[PDB]
Amino acid sequence: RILTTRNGHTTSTTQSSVGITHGYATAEDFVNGPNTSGLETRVIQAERFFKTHLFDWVTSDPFGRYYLLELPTDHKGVYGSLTDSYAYMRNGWDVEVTAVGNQFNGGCLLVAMVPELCSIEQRELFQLTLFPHQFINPRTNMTAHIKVPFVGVNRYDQYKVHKPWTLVVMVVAPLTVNTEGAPQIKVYANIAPTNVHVAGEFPSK
Amino acid sequence: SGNTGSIINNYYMQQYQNSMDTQLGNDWFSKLASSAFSGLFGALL
Amino acid sequence: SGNTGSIINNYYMQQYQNSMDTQLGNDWFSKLASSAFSGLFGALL
Amino acid sequence: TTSTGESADPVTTTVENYGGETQVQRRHHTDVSFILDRFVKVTPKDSINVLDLMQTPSHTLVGALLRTATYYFADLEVAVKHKGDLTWVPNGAPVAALDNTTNPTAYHKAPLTRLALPYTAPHRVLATVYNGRPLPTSFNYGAIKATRVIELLYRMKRAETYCPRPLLAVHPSAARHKQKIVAP
Amino acid sequence: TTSTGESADPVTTTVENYGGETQVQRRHHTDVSFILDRFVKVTPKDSINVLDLMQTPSHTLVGALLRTATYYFADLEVAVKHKGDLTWVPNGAPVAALDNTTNPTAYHKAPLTRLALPYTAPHRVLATVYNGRPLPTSFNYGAIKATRVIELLYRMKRAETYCPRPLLAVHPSAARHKQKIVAP
Amino acid sequence: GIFPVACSDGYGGLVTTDPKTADPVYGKVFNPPRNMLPGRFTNLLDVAEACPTFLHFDGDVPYVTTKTDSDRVLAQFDLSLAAKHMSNTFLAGLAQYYTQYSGTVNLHFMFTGPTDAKARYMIAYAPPGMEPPKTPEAAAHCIHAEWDTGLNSKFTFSIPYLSAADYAYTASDAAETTNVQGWVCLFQITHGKAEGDALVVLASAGKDFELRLPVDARQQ
Amino acid sequence: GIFPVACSDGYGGLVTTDPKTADPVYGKVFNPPRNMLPGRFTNLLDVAEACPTFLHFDGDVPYVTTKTDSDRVLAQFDLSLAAKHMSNTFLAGLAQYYTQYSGTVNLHFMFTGPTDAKARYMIAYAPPGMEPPKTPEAAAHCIHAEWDTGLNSKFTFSIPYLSAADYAYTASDAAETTNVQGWVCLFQITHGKAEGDALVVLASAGKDFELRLPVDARQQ
């Protein structure tokens, strides 16, 4: 039930989590390859949480609204400065998507961290439970907390061009404010980069 | 091992037959199928 | 050993395959590459 | 077998819940490196065409069990009906290279010409989709040219794939997708 | 890594000077007896032509990694499309010899005729350049004749060379020598 | 004399599925390392068992709503890997490239109502020969099994494999309108203040699913 | 009966790079001895490492003169084995017959001024993504390294290999104007009575240069 996760100097507590969904691996692969010549360093100051707004769940939305965002998104803090001050870098992800409703709102919600994609057709939605996923069901839980490692074609990636992961939500069953439930839900996210490495330095202005 | 069905070693060497692999320093989805919970979750009668 | 990639000895004898060598009584440029000085030449700090 | 559904934890209850007894289930025909080794046929181009594993159609057996895996690595094989002196450049050669005879060149010998060429690419593993639809230039196996290429086939060797992707069956209008089946 | 430069002593400082760590560098594709064994094609003459390893063009892959070594020794191979009864004299035979059948003579058999002939010459090792441009008569491998030679190829075996010589890349007008590369 | 062989007749043709391998031309290639890339799968049925996918009920939604009227049947469909209710799912997408199958097919039922809504459901399996049942009281002689909603949401019932022939087809020819495999019916016994709720369903491969005789036949 | 074989189809063609060897016709030849001829080299990269060669700066000379004006940049060029500044050198002449490379490339800088002239230089490596630096104060955040002239004349700095993909091309297609590998800039910090002097440069293969995928493509 109760579960407290901590990344860096930031924490988070949830009292209804149904577990963590490790995806595609438990540990990361070898991070000192032959391409970087050993000129790579591991920054630890940039493994803290940060937040964003996805959308607002509402009764009008039928099955199949996804509203996906691709990340690494723009970042005010430290991790946002690394892609500006370094060429190649790699990092996993540790998401947490929260939708606080009520004990009495029926409906469902599916969230999965899928690899590289731009758009999904309506037929492929029925098969979204192949990627690391978790259901948000307002009768029981309110947080997802998927946990995926870095994966890509080549070892170190240039985040100015290739965005490998893409957090995807989806309304499996419509919201129903039957009698006493909250009129609408506002979905948020609590992503946090984990295990960030970085190599190759830029000349400033 | 794919559609390879001869009991004689191929005439050509291994390195000329195909690209030799290199090491540094189904695997995962088969670990998932074995983790599958199958027992009863309640008290049987 | 060049583009020779069979695991079976050639049907013809060695002397008929190619000119047999004769003795009397990469060799040098590979000795040069190993002689290459690479350490630091001054006092590091 | 009630269990928390919103957990993505696999739960495969069996027939032994109500007296059943599972027979033995052996799966050889559904392996990933056994089903891809079958000479899928691609729509061949004119004189010069590139060896890219994605120009194969998306409704074949090899073309559709390949666009179900995000990443893949596999050696290659071809068998072409060249009307000429087909040559083959490696990955990354200037496209004017496939006019010289020093590159691996097979001479005409009726009817086919079956080659087994390695996997040459900078990346440790290729990819079907790419989040830049056009993929980069680096994703290929090489380029062959002849006077008039007539046929072309692909047969992946040692195939191994990662990170699955959705597969789609044909949607029928009726309740059930009926059709013909061979019968004496 | 300051060292006296006017000494011709090789000095190869590495990436470990500022924290680096050299990966492993394996070189098989650049050996001297592996890169020359590739059937370079020469401009074939009429009925009679001589087997000299220097009439191959100076811009191929075999013709240009050969005019980078002062001396060389290598057995030979050919594969010619003779329209006739091709014969082959050894090195130094009177040029009227390649009309008799006792000399090694291959009969017509479509499409090619691949031979593996030894290295016969007085000198212990041949040479590309010679400070007597015309080289002497003694520098060759033999002479073949047929009714009409159509194609000819050279494939050195057991090649081994000495005393390197300069190699030249093409000089571009722009800052960088751009060109096409194969792309899907 | 040389070793004399006899060139046999009717051999050596390029069969598209021969076990032989071609002869190389280039050789000596060392590719980059791939030690422990995340998420490799070896067999195509391993992913089918570990990951379920939704069905396709009436309309486009994958869920069935609770019937408040005199009717009690939610939705009953054929037991065929070509059926419409299984049009777009992994297990039925993969099983169009193979001819025959033999095994169990799990069904995962997940209730997504409010905290103050309760319901009770039944799923039964009717074999071929008799028309499918139409009332729960007339379907209790099958291999049915009932579950009740509560703290644990999902319930998974694995319909068995019963067939005279050892293996069964993954297609439906027009000549056979009898649906040789049978049906699988899903009824709703009763419900309490469960108006307009949802029961999303899923489908996964069984513990002993077997799929064989590969034929790539006109899908892409 | 004789041993029956099946003549396979689509085999035996004369591939220009087959590992097979032809059958002899003459035999029994003993060639003159070659025991220990001077100067044999086995690999083509061994000569590339042990012997450096000059670059091709502006004009035709291989040296750069000292800038006495407000400018501080001597000459910056692309990091590509096809670049113009490396037009005619062994390492770039050999690397046109191969497709890909991966390793380090040493640069040897040799100062040839009088005894009473002093100078100080910097060389920095700027990766792709940002335009190259234009001032030494804005280039000190790279992998730079500075040296000073004195008793020992030559200083050798080996630019590293940094790349996402494991191997990199030895060509530059017109579609890619971005110079995917980067730049290498060379600046002159200050100088004392160093008018019109010379700093000849060289270039050699690294300790772990690797060159592969041979293609002889239209140079001779």
Author numbering:
A (entry chain 2): 13 to 217
B (entry chain 4), C (entry chain 4): 15 to 39, 65 to 84
D (entry chain 1), E (entry chain 1): 1 to 132, 157 to 208
F (entry chain 3), G (entry chain 3): 1 to 220
Q: What did the article's authors report about this structure?
A:
Therefore, thermostable FMD particles are needed for use in vaccines. This study generated thermostable FMDV mutants (M3 and M10) by serial passages at high temperature, subsequent amplification, and purification. Sequence analysis of the P1 region revealed the following three unique mutants with stable nonsynonymous capsid mutations compared with the wild-type virus: M3 (V2056I, A1013T, K1133E, and T1174I), M9 (Y2079H, K1045Q, A1079V, and D1085E), and M10 (A1013T). The capsids of the mutants M3 and M10 were able to resist higher temperatures than that of the wild-type virus. Among these three mutants, the Tr values of M3 and M10 mutants were increased to the largest extent of 6 to 7°C compared with that of the wild-type strain. To elucidate the molecular mechanism underlying the stabilization of mutant M3, the structure of the SDG-purified 146S particles of the wild-type and mutant M3 viruses were determined by single-particle cryo-EM. Icosahedral reconstruction of particles was achieved at resolutions of 3.1 Å and 3.6 Å, respectively. Among the four residues mutated in M3 (V2056I, A1013T, K1133E, and T1174I), 3 amino acid residues were well observed, but VP1 residue 133 is located at the flexible G-H loop and could not be well resolved. Mutation T1174I is located near the capsid’s 5-fold axis and, thus, is unlikely to improve capsid stability from a structural point of view. However, mutation A1013T interacts with VP3 from an adjacent protomer within the same pentamer and forms an extra hydrogen bond with T3156, which directly increases mutant M3 stability by increasing the interaction area by about 67 Å2 (rectangle 1). On the other hand, the bigger hydrophobic side chain of I2056 at the pentamer interface pushes the hydrophilic side chain of Q2057 to form a hydrogen bond with Y2098 of the adjacent VP2, reinforcing the charge interaction between the αB helix and βE-hairpin of VP2 to stabilize the 2-fold axis of the capsid (rectangle 2).
Foot-and-mouth disease (FMD) is a global disease of cloven-hoofed animals, highly infectious, and antigenically variable, which poses a major threat to the animal industry and causes enormous economic losses. FMD virus (FMDV) is a member of the Aphthovirus genus within the Picornaviridae family. It is approximately 30 nm in diameter, forms an icosahedral structure with a sedimentation coefficient of 146S, and consists of 60 copies of each of the capsid proteins VP1 to VP4 (9). FMDV is more highly sensitive to acids and heat than other picornaviruses, which is conducive to virus infection and replication.
